Amino acid sequence: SVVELGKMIIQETGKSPFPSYTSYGCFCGGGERGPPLDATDRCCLAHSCCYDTLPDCSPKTDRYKYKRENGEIICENSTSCKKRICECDKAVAVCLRKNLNTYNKKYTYYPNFWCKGDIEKC
Amino acid sequence: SVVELGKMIIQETGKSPFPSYTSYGCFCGGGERGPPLDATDRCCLAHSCCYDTLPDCSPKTDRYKYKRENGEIICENSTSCKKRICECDKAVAVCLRKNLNTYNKKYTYYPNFWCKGDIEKC
Numbered sequence: 381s382v383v384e385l386g387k388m389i390i391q392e393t394g395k396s397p398f399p400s401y402t403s404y405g406c407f408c409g410g411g412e413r414g415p416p417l418d419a420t421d422r423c424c425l426a427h428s429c430c431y432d433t434l435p436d437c438s439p440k441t442d443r444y445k446y447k448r449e450n451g452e453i454i455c456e457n458s459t460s461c462k463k464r465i466c467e468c469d470k471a472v473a474v475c476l477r478k479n480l481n482t483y484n485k486k487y488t489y490y491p492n493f494w495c496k497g498d499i500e501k502c
Numbered sequence: 503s504v505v506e507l508g509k510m511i512i513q514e515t516g517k518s519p520f521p522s523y524t525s526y527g528c529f530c531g532g533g534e535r536g537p538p539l540d541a542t543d544r545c546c547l548a549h550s551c552c553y554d555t556l557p558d559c560s561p562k563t564d565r566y567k568y569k570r571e572n573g574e575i576i577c578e579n580s581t582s583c584k585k586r587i588c589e590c591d592k593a594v595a596v597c598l599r600k601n602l603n604t605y606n607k608k609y610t611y612y613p614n615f616w617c618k619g620d621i622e623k624c
C-alpha cells in the first residue's frame with residue numbers, strides 16, 4: 381500500500397513523499413540502525429516498528445481505502461490486514477505533519493553509512 | 503510488486519535494493535530530471551519508462567510469480583500485467599548486474615535537486 385501511504389503523506393505534509401521523505405535521515409524510506417536524527421526520523425522509526433507488527437500482512441502491497449472525517453484519517457475494515465496497515469500509515473503521516481517545523485533539508489538525503497548505532501528494539 | 507523487484511535485485515546484483523539502489527543518482531528510486539549520471543542510472547530511467555508502458559497495471563503493488571531457469575529469470579503469465587510488470591523488473595535487475603562494475607558510491611545518496619536537466623521523453 382505504498383500508494384496509499386504516499387497519498388496520506390501528501391495530504392498531511394503537503395510534501396511529496398519523493399524526494400522529501402523517501403531517504404530522510406536514518407529511518408525514513410528504510411534503515412534499521414540509528415540513533416534517529418530528529419522527530420521526523422523518529423516518526424519513521426515508529427512506522428518501521430508498526431510494520432513489524434504485521435508479519436501476517438503485506439504492508440507494502442496490500443491496497444486499502446480511507447476517508448477523512450473532520451480532518452482526521454478514518455481507516456477502512458474490509459480485512460484485518462488493511463485496517464492495521466492503514467493505521468500504521470495514518471500514524472506516520474500525522475507524525476510527519478506534527479514535526480514539519482523541524483524538518484531538516486540536510487537530512488533529506490542523509491548517507492546511511494552515517495547511521496552507526498545498533499538495531500534498537502522497538 | 504516492489505517485493506518481487508527487490509528479490510530480483512538481490513538475486514542479480516547480490517545487493518539489497520536499500521540502500522544501494524533506493525536513491526541512486528537521478529532516477530533510481532525515483533526522479534524525472536536528468537541527465538542520468540551513469541549506466542546504472544540509465545538502467546533505472548529505462549525501468550521507469552518501462553513502467554510507463556503499463557498504465558493498465560499497478561507495477562508497484564501487483565504481486566507476481568517468477569522462476570530462474572538456467573540462471574535466467576522466467577516470468578509468469580497468469581495475467582498480462584503480471585507478465586509485463588515482471589519483464590520490466592527482470593530487465594532492470596539484469597541491467598544493474600551488467601553495470602555493477604561502474605557503480606559509484608558517491609551517487610548512492612545523490613541529492614535530487616542536483617538533477618537540473620529537462621524531463622526527457624522516454
Ligand SMILES: CCCCCCCCCCCC(=O)O
Pocket residue numbers: 382385386389397401402403407408409410411423424425427428429431472524
Ligand atoms: C522508500 C519508498 C517508500 C516511500 C514511502 C514514504 C516514506 C515513509 C517513511 C516510513 C519509513 C519506513 O517505515 O520505512
Ligand SMILES: CCCCCCCCCCCC(=O)O
Pocket residue numbers: 402504507508519520523524529530531532533546547549550594
Ligand atoms: C524507492 C523504493 C523502490 C526500491 C526498489 C529499488 C529501485 C529500483 C530501481 C528502479 C528505479 C525506478 O523505476 O524508480
